Paper text:
The NS3/4A protease is an excellent target for developing DAAs against HCV, and protease inhibitors have been a key component of most combination therapies. This essential protease cleaves the HCV polyprotein into functional units necessary for viral replication and maturation. Structurally Asp168 is a critical residue that contributes to an active-site electrostatic network necessary for efficient inhibitor binding. We rationally designed HCV protease inhibitors that retain potency while fitting within the substrate envelope to avoid resistance, particularly against D168A, which confers high-level resistance to current HCV PIs.
Author numbering: 983 to 1179
Write the structure that this text describes.
Amino acid sequence: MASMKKKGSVVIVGRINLSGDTAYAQQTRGEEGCQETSQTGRDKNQVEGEVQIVSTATQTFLATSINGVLWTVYHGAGTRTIASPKGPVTQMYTNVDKDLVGWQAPQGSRSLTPCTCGSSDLYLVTRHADVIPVRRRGDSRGSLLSPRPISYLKGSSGGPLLCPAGHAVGIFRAAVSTRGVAKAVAFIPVESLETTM
Ligand SMILES: COc1ccc2nc(C)c(O[C@@H]3C[C@H]4C(=O)N[C@]5(C(=O)NS(=O)(=O)C6(C)CC6)C[C@H]5/C=C\CCCCC[C@H](NC(=O)OC(C)(C)C)C(=O)N4C3)nc2c1
Ligand SMILES: [Zn+2]
């Protein structure tokens, strides 16, 4: 009992910058500082933007702020706290059945607005700041206009699918893979986030 370890916090280590005309990834914390912040849960770094790059000791993925909540996938975050300036913050939403978790959005982040356009021309944002056109094909699936090896999408779970006007349509969850090629993606629809709320 006395030696049982604690899992560390999820740590914001960068962001996907969408503020201007060029999308690009920014790193805001290196691997050593990430490891230390994960164990303490105390992250005093400035947060900006809608799409964060996040890490645990063993994985790296994305998280997206919608309606004042920073959302990501359960398969990346599990039940972990997130590091914050005052110490670890507990998830306010956890739904393993949806592969969904959420924490209160960090001070300084910006939130996306849920889409009400009813449009099926979407855009997936990856951890490399690629903006991938995706045609919506059902409630929780979309096809890539240009299929990509799954290598290209790995590490982008938790990222957004957006409509043409930049509203949030969903959270990227899984790639639909044939012979290692992603022809489609599965996502958590923003309406499911809204119901979880
Ligand atoms: C533990 O509790 C849970 C609860 C719910 C759950 N729901 C799940 C749906 C679930 O799927 C598993 C995780 C998820 C996954 O790899 N996502 C990311 C990603 O980038 N991840 S990540 O950032 O690298 C990482 C790994 C966090 C750091 C987006 C894709 C990028 C590339 C695809 C690589 C090859 C895997 C292809 C799987 N295709 C797949 O299953 O397709 C369907 C059509 C669904 C069969 C798939 O995509 N997969 C399996 N695992 C869970 C686990
Ligand atoms: Zn919209």
